[PDB]
Amino acid sequence: SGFGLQSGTARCYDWYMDYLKCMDESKAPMITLRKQECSEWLEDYNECLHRDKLKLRKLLIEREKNKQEAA
Amino acid sequence: VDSQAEWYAEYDKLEKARQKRRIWKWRDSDSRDEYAINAEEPVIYIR
């Protein structure tokens, strides 16, 4: 869809549109090639959707904090 | 009955048909989604 819940657009609509624009700019003759060229934009969209890198960073910080506290 | 003319005409007809067939056999994907392979084609989407 792309529409928001309260109004406007979805929380991560713009990141997806960025990736789509990048694919449109690319001249690769196959979609697979274009996705390979635009993979970094897809990684940004996935990062905004789930915040996996931020979760890993928080996990590492918490774990080190626990190690310092125990010592 | 000019046999040479008939033979050359028949051979030419078969060769033209073979060429037309090979040209016909050159077919890219016609998928609506597959915009990359068909970028130059003039299409309008009502969606």
GROMACS .gro file of N, CA and C in nm:
model
  354
    1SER      N    1   0.083  -0.120   0.000
    1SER     CA    2   0.000   0.000   0.000
    1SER      C    3   0.086   0.126   0.000
    2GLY      N    4   0.137   0.162   0.117
    2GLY     CA    5   0.220   0.279   0.134
    2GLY      C    6   0.157   0.389   0.216
    3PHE      N    7   0.026   0.383   0.239
    3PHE     CA    8  -0.043   0.484   0.318
    3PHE      C    9  -0.015   0.463   0.465
    4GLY      N   10  -0.022   0.571   0.542
    4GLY     CA   11   0.003   0.561   0.684
    4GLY      C   12  -0.122   0.519   0.758
    5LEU      N   13  -0.107   0.500   0.888
    5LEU     CA   14  -0.220   0.458   0.970
    5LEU      C   15  -0.303   0.578   1.015
    6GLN      N   16  -0.237   0.683   1.064
    6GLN     CA   17  -0.308   0.802   1.109
    6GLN      C   18  -0.325   0.903   0.996
    7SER      N   19  -0.225   0.911   0.908
    7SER     CA   20  -0.221   1.002   0.794
    7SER      C   21  -0.086   0.988   0.726
    8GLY      N   22  -0.060   1.070   0.625
    8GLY     CA   23   0.072   1.073   0.564
    8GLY      C   24   0.108   0.943   0.496
    9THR      N   25   0.219   0.883   0.537
    9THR     CA   26   0.271   0.761   0.477
    9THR      C   27   0.325   0.670   0.586
   10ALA      N   28   0.363   0.549   0.546
   10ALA     CA   29   0.413   0.450   0.641
   10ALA      C   30   0.543   0.497   0.704
   11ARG      N   31   0.580   0.433   0.815
   11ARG     CA   32   0.698   0.476   0.890
   11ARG      C   33   0.825   0.467   0.806
   12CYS      N   34   0.832   0.372   0.713
   12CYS     CA   35   0.953   0.347   0.634
   12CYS      C   36   0.923   0.353   0.485
   13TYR      N   37   0.822   0.431   0.447
   13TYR     CA   38   0.787   0.446   0.307
   13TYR      C   39   0.899   0.514   0.229
   14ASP      N   40   0.959   0.618   0.288
   14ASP     CA   41   1.060   0.697   0.219
   14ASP      C   42   1.185   0.615   0.188
   15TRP      N   43   1.226   0.527   0.280
   15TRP     CA   44   1.343   0.443   0.254
   15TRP      C   45   1.317   0.350   0.136
   16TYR      N   46   1.197   0.292   0.130
   16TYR     CA   47   1.164   0.205   0.018
   16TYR      C   48   1.161   0.285  -0.111
   17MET      N   49   1.105   0.406  -0.106
   17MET     CA   50   1.099   0.487  -0.227
   17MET      C   51   1.238   0.525  -0.273
   18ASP      N   52   1.330   0.547  -0.178
   18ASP     CA   53   1.469   0.575  -0.212
   18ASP      C   54   1.529   0.457  -0.288
   19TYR      N   55   1.506   0.336  -0.237
   19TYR     CA   56   1.556   0.216  -0.304
   19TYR      C   57   1.494   0.200  -0.443
   20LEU      N   58   1.364   0.228  -0.456
   20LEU     CA   59   1.298   0.220  -0.586
   20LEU      C   60   1.354   0.323  -0.683
   21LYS      N   61   1.382   0.444  -0.634
   21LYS     CA   62   1.442   0.546  -0.720
   21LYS      C   63   1.579   0.502  -0.767
   22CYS      N   64   1.657   0.442  -0.676
   22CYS     CA   65   1.790   0.395  -0.715
   22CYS      C   66   1.779   0.289  -0.823
   23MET      N   67   1.683   0.197  -0.809
   23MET     CA   68   1.666   0.094  -0.911
   23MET      C   69   1.623   0.155  -1.044
   24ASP      N   70   1.537   0.257  -1.039
   24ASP     CA   71   1.495   0.325  -1.162
   24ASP      C   72   1.613   0.391  -1.232
   25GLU      N   73   1.703   0.453  -1.155
   25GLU     CA   74   1.820   0.517  -1.215
   25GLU      C   75   1.910   0.416  -1.285
   26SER      N   76   1.924   0.296  -1.228
   26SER     CA   77   2.015   0.196  -1.282
   26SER      C   78   1.974   0.153  -1.422
   27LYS      N   79   2.074   0.118  -1.503
   27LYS     CA   80   2.053   0.079  -1.642
   27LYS      C   81   2.074  -0.070  -1.664
   28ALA      N   82   2.088  -0.148  -1.557
   28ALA     CA   83   2.117  -0.290  -1.570
   28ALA      C   84   2.005  -0.360  -1.646
   29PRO      N   85   2.037  -0.451  -1.738
   29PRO     CA   86   1.933  -0.513  -1.821
   29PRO      C   87   1.844  -0.612  -1.747
   30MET      N   88   1.881  -0.658  -1.628
   30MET     CA   89   1.796  -0.747  -1.549
   30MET      C   90   1.770  -0.689  -1.411
   31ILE      N   91   1.655  -0.727  -1.354
   31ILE     CA   92   1.617  -0.678  -1.221
   31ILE      C   93   1.715  -0.727  -1.115
   32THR      N   94   1.763  -0.851  -1.127
   32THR     CA   95   1.861  -0.902  -1.032
   32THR      C   96   1.983  -0.812  -1.025
   33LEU      N   97   2.036  -0.774  -1.142
   33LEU     CA   98   2.152  -0.686  -1.146
   33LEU      C   99   2.123  -0.554  -1.077
   34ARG      N  100   2.007  -0.493  -1.106
   34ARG     CA  101   1.976  -0.365  -1.045
   34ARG      C  102   1.966  -0.377  -0.894
   35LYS      N  103   1.905  -0.486  -0.845
   35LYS     CA  104   1.897  -0.505  -0.701
   35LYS      C  105   2.036  -0.519  -0.641
   36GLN      N  106   2.126  -0.586  -0.713
   36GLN     CA  107   2.264  -0.597  -0.665
   36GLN      C  108   2.330  -0.460  -0.656
   37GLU      N  109   2.307  -0.375  -0.757
   37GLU     CA  110   2.362  -0.239  -0.755
   37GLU      C  111   2.302  -0.155  -0.643
   38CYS      N  112   2.173  -0.173  -0.615
   38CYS     CA  113   2.100  -0.093  -0.517
   38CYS      C  114   2.087  -0.163  -0.382
   39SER      N  115   2.170  -0.264  -0.356
   39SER     CA  116   2.158  -0.342  -0.233
   39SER      C  117   2.173  -0.254  -0.108
   40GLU      N  118   2.262  -0.154  -0.112
   40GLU     CA  119   2.283  -0.072   0.006
   40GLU      C  120   2.156   0.002   0.048
   41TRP      N  121   2.078   0.049  -0.050
   41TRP     CA  122   1.951   0.113  -0.019
   41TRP      C  123   1.854   0.014   0.045
   42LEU      N  124   1.855  -0.110  -0.003
   42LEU     CA  125   1.772  -0.213   0.058
   42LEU      C  126   1.816  -0.239   0.202
   43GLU      N  127   1.948  -0.240   0.226
   43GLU     CA  128   1.997  -0.256   0.362
   43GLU      C  129   1.951  -0.142   0.451
   44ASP      N  130   1.941  -0.021   0.396
   44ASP     CA  131   1.889   0.090   0.475
   44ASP      C  132   1.741   0.073   0.506
   45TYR      N  133   1.663   0.026   0.408
   45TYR     CA  134   1.521   0.004   0.434
   45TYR      C  135   1.501  -0.105   0.538
   46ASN      N  136   1.577  -0.215   0.527
   46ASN     CA  137   1.566  -0.322   0.625
   46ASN      C  138   1.610  -0.275   0.762
   47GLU      N  139   1.714  -0.192   0.767
   47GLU     CA  140   1.762  -0.137   0.893
   47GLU      C  141   1.656  -0.050   0.959
   48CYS      N  142   1.583   0.030   0.880
   48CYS     CA  143   1.482   0.116   0.941
   48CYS      C  144   1.365   0.032   0.989
   49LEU      N  145   1.332  -0.075   0.916
   49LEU     CA  146   1.215  -0.155   0.948
   49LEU      C  147   1.231  -0.225   1.083
   50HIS      N  148   1.345  -0.292   1.104
   50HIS     CA  149   1.365  -0.377   1.220
   50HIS      C  150   1.467  -0.325   1.320
   51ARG      N  151   1.552  -0.229   1.282
   51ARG     CA  152   1.655  -0.175   1.370
   51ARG      C  153   1.748  -0.283   1.424
   52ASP      N  154   1.788  -0.375   1.337
   52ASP     CA  155   1.867  -0.490   1.380
   52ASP      C  156   2.007  -0.448   1.426
   53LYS      N  157   2.071  -0.355   1.354
   53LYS     CA  158   2.202  -0.307   1.396
   53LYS      C  159   2.195  -0.238   1.532
   54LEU      N  160   2.091  -0.157   1.555
   54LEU     CA  161   2.081  -0.088   1.683
   54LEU      C  162   2.058  -0.189   1.795
   55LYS      N  163   1.982  -0.294   1.767
   55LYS     CA  164   1.958  -0.396   1.868
   55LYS      C  165   2.087  -0.469   1.900
   56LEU      N  166   2.166  -0.501   1.798
   56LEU     CA  167   2.293  -0.568   1.825
   56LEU      C  168   2.384  -0.477   1.907
   57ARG      N  169   2.388  -0.348   1.873
   57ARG     CA  170   2.474  -0.256   1.944
   57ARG      C  171   2.433  -0.247   2.090
   58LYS      N  172   2.301  -0.243   2.115
   58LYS     CA  173   2.252  -0.234   2.251
   58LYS      C  174   2.287  -0.362   2.327
   59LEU      N  175   2.275  -0.477   2.260
   59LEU     CA  176   2.307  -0.603   2.324
   59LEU      C  177   2.453  -0.605   2.367
   60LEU      N  178   2.543  -0.562   2.278
   60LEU     CA  179   2.685  -0.560   2.310
   60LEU      C  180   2.715  -0.465   2.425
   61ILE      N  181   2.652  -0.347   2.425
   61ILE     CA  182   2.672  -0.251   2.533
   61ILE      C  183   2.625  -0.310   2.665
   62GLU      N  184   2.504  -0.366   2.667
   62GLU     CA  185   2.451  -0.427   2.789
   62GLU      C  186   2.543  -0.537   2.839
   63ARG      N  187   2.588  -0.625   2.749
   63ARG     CA  188   2.672  -0.737   2.788
   63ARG      C  189   2.804  -0.688   2.849
   64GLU      N  190   2.866  -0.588   2.787
   64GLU     CA  191   2.989  -0.533   2.844
   64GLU      C  192   2.963  -0.465   2.978
   65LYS      N  193   2.850  -0.396   2.991
   65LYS     CA  194   2.816  -0.333   3.117
   65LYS      C  195   2.800  -0.438   3.227
   66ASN      N  196   2.737  -0.550   3.194
   66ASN     CA  197   2.723  -0.659   3.290
   66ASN      C  198   2.859  -0.715   3.328
   67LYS      N  199   2.948  -0.729   3.230
   67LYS     CA  200   3.082  -0.780   3.259
   67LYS      C  201   3.156  -0.685   3.353
   68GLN      N  202   3.146  -0.554   3.328
   68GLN     CA  203   3.211  -0.457   3.416
   68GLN      C  204   3.152  -0.463   3.556
   69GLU      N  205   3.019  -0.474   3.566
   69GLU     CA  206   2.953  -0.476   3.696
   69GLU      C  207   2.994  -0.598   3.777
   70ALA      N  208   3.000  -0.715   3.712
   70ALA     CA  209   3.035  -0.837   3.784
   70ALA      C  210   3.176  -0.831   3.839
   71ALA      N  211   3.271  -0.781   3.759
   71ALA     CA  212   3.411  -0.771   3.799
   71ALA      C  213   3.427  -0.692   3.929
   72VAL      N  214   0.913  -2.483  -6.907
   72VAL     CA  215   0.951  -2.535  -6.777
   72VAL      C  216   1.100  -2.513  -6.748
   73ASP      N  217   1.130  -2.400  -6.685
   73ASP     CA  218   1.268  -2.365  -6.650
   73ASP      C  219   1.294  -2.422  -6.511
   74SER      N  220   1.356  -2.540  -6.508
   74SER     CA  221   1.381  -2.610  -6.382
   74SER      C  222   1.476  -2.531  -6.292
   75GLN      N  223   1.577  -2.466  -6.350
   75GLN     CA  224   1.671  -2.390  -6.269
   75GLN      C  225   1.601  -2.278  -6.194
   76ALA      N  226   1.511  -2.207  -6.262
   76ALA     CA  227   1.439  -2.098  -6.198
   76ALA      C  228   1.351  -2.151  -6.086
   77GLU      N  229   1.283  -2.263  -6.110
   77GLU     CA  230   1.196  -2.321  -6.008
   77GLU      C  231   1.277  -2.363  -5.886
   78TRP      N  232   1.393  -2.425  -5.908
   78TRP     CA  233   1.474  -2.470  -5.796
   78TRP      C  234   1.522  -2.351  -5.714
   79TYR      N  235   1.572  -2.248  -5.781
   79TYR     CA  236   1.623  -2.132  -5.708
   79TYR      C  237   1.511  -2.060  -5.634
   80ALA      N  238   1.392  -2.051  -5.696
   80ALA     CA  239   1.279  -1.988  -5.630
   80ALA      C  240   1.239  -2.066  -5.505
   81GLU      N  241   1.233  -2.199  -5.515
   81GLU     CA  242   1.195  -2.279  -5.399
   81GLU      C  243   1.298  -2.266  -5.288
   82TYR      N  244   1.427  -2.269  -5.324
   82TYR     CA  245   1.530  -2.258  -5.222
   82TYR      C  246   1.518  -2.123  -5.154
   83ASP      N  247   1.495  -2.018  -5.233
   83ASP     CA  248   1.487  -1.884  -5.177
   83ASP      C  249   1.370  -1.876  -5.081
   84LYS      N  250   1.257  -1.935  -5.118
   84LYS     CA  251   1.138  -1.929  -5.033
   84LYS      C  252   1.166  -1.997  -4.900
   85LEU      N  253   1.232  -2.113  -4.905
   85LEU     CA  254   1.265  -2.184  -4.781
   85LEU      C  255   1.363  -2.104  -4.697
   86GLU      N  256   1.460  -2.039  -4.761
   86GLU     CA  257   1.559  -1.963  -4.685
   86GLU      C  258   1.494  -1.841  -4.621
   87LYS      N  259   1.402  -1.775  -4.692
   87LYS     CA  260   1.332  -1.662  -4.635
   87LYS      C  261   1.248  -1.707  -4.517
   88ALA      N  262   1.182  -1.822  -4.529
   88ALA     CA  263   1.101  -1.871  -4.418
   88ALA      C  264   1.188  -1.901  -4.297
   89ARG      N  265   1.306  -1.960  -4.320
   89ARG     CA  266   1.395  -1.991  -4.208
   89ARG      C  267   1.440  -1.863  -4.140
   90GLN      N  268   1.473  -1.761  -4.219
   90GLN     CA  269   1.517  -1.634  -4.161
   90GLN      C  270   1.405  -1.572  -4.080
   91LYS      N  271   1.284  -1.573  -4.135
   91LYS     CA  272   1.171  -1.513  -4.066
   91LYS      C  273   1.145  -1.587  -3.935
   92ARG      N  274   1.164  -1.719  -3.937
   92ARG     CA  275   1.143  -1.799  -3.817
   92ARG      C  276   1.244  -1.761  -3.710
   93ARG      N  277   1.371  -1.748  -3.749
   93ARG     CA  278   1.475  -1.714  -3.652
   93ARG      C  279   1.452  -1.576  -3.594
   94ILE      N  280   1.406  -1.481  -3.677
   94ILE     CA  281   1.373  -1.348  -3.627
   94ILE      C  282   1.257  -1.357  -3.528
   95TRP      N  283   1.157  -1.439  -3.561
   95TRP     CA  284   1.043  -1.461  -3.474
   95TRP      C  285   1.084  -1.525  -3.342
   96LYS      N  286   1.183  -1.615  -3.345
   96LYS     CA  287   1.228  -1.685  -3.225
   96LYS      C  288   1.306  -1.596  -3.128
   97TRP      N  289   1.344  -1.475  -3.169
   97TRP     CA  290   1.408  -1.380  -3.079
   97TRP      C  291   1.298  -1.310  -3.000
   98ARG      N  292   1.275  -1.355  -2.876
   98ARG     CA  293   1.166  -1.307  -2.793
   98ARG      C  294   1.214  -1.278  -2.652
   99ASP      N  295   1.207  -1.151  -2.611
   99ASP     CA  296   1.240  -1.118  -2.473
   99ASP      C  297   1.117  -1.142  -2.385
  100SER      N  298   1.137  -1.133  -2.254
  100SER     CA  299   1.023  -1.146  -2.164
  100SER      C  300   0.926  -1.030  -2.185
  101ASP      N  301   0.797  -1.062  -2.188
  101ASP     CA  302   0.693  -0.961  -2.203
  101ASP      C  303   0.623  -0.928  -2.072
  102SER      N  304   0.681  -0.968  -1.959
  102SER     CA  305   0.617  -0.946  -1.830
  102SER      C  306   0.597  -0.797  -1.805
  103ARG      N  307   0.480  -0.761  -1.752
  103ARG     CA  308   0.455  -0.622  -1.718
  103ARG      C  309   0.551  -0.575  -1.609
  104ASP      N  310   0.580  -0.662  -1.512
  104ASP     CA  311   0.672  -0.627  -1.404
  104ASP      C  312   0.814  -0.606  -1.456
  105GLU      N  313   0.855  -0.684  -1.556
  105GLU     CA  314   0.993  -0.681  -1.605
  105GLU      C  315   1.016  -0.556  -1.690
  106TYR      N  316   1.029  -0.443  -1.621
  106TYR     CA  317   1.060  -0.315  -1.685
  106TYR      C  318   1.204  -0.306  -1.734
  107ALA      N  319   1.299  -0.371  -1.664
  107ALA     CA  320   1.440  -0.361  -1.701
  107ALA      C  321   1.468  -0.416  -1.841
  108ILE      N  322   1.418  -0.536  -1.872
  108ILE     CA  323   1.450  -0.595  -2.002
  108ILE      C  324   1.380  -0.522  -2.115
  109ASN      N  325   1.268  -0.456  -2.087
  109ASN     CA  326   1.186  -0.391  -2.188
  109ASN      C  327   1.185  -0.239  -2.172
  110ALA      N  328   1.295  -0.180  -2.127
  110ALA     CA  329   1.295  -0.037  -2.095
  110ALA      C  330   1.255   0.050  -2.213
  111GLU      N  331   1.304   0.019  -2.333
  111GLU     CA  332   1.275   0.103  -2.449
  111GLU      C  333   1.131   0.092  -2.501
  112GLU      N  334   1.054  -0.008  -2.457
  112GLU     CA  335   0.920  -0.028  -2.513
  112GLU      C  336   0.824   0.083  -2.470
  113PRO      N  337   0.738   0.130  -2.561
  113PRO     CA  338   0.638   0.231  -2.524
  113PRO      C  339   0.510   0.171  -2.468
  114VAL      N  340   0.497   0.171  -2.336
  114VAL     CA  341   0.380   0.116  -2.269
  114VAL      C  342   0.322   0.219  -2.173
  115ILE      N  343   0.190   0.214  -2.154
  115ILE     CA  344   0.122   0.299  -2.058
  115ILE      C  345   0.052   0.206  -1.960
  116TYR      N  346   0.071   0.229  -1.830
  116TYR     CA  347   0.006   0.147  -1.729
  116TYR      C  348  -0.107   0.223  -1.661
  117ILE      N  349  -0.226   0.164  -1.662
  117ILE     CA  350  -0.339   0.215  -1.587
  117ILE      C  351  -0.352   0.125  -1.465
  118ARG      N  352  -0.322   0.176  -1.346
  118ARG     CA  353  -0.319   0.087  -1.231
  118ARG      C  354  -0.378   0.156  -1.108
   0.00000   0.00000   0.00000
